[PDB]
């Protein structure tokens with residue numbers, strides 16, 4: 001996926017969705033907060 | 049439903065007709081029902097007061 | 099190919115989906131160099 005910036009209060013350690021998919025990770029080094037977003041994908045319609 | 053479903057394959061194809069066109073159709077039906085009567089549902093319309 | 103035919107009639111068809119392929123890898127581990135080979139490669143263990 002793609003790692004973006006997000007600003008929420010994350011005092012609890014490490015990682016989170018309805019489907020329990022992870023939305024943030026605590027970096028083992030340079031401890032900060034990142035966000036995970038799936039790669040852009042979509043259906044293709046072939047008009048002819 | 050906001051974005052988790054949209055990020056697990058689940059897509060929502062938009063409806064073919066937008067709300068504005070549906071509103072235009074309803075406005076047309078009202079216009080015919082008011083200024084025409086039941087005629088406009090059977091071909092050409094006729095004008096008759098209310 | 100999807101229709102398994104030679105003459106497609108008309109309209110709109112959904113063949114497949116496209117996704118962005120991953121570019122590189124991101125390996126991120128904590129920095130520790132400690133060792134723990136406590137397997138005796140002397141004590142006769144115990145019961």
Ligand SMILES: *[C@@H]1O[C@H](CO)[C@@H](O)[C@H](O)[C@H]1NC(C)=O
Pocket residue numbers: 029030129
């Ligand atoms: C491990 O990395 C962190 C990152 O800031 C650093 O502060 C720490 O000194 C490092 N530990 C080492 C090099 O033993």
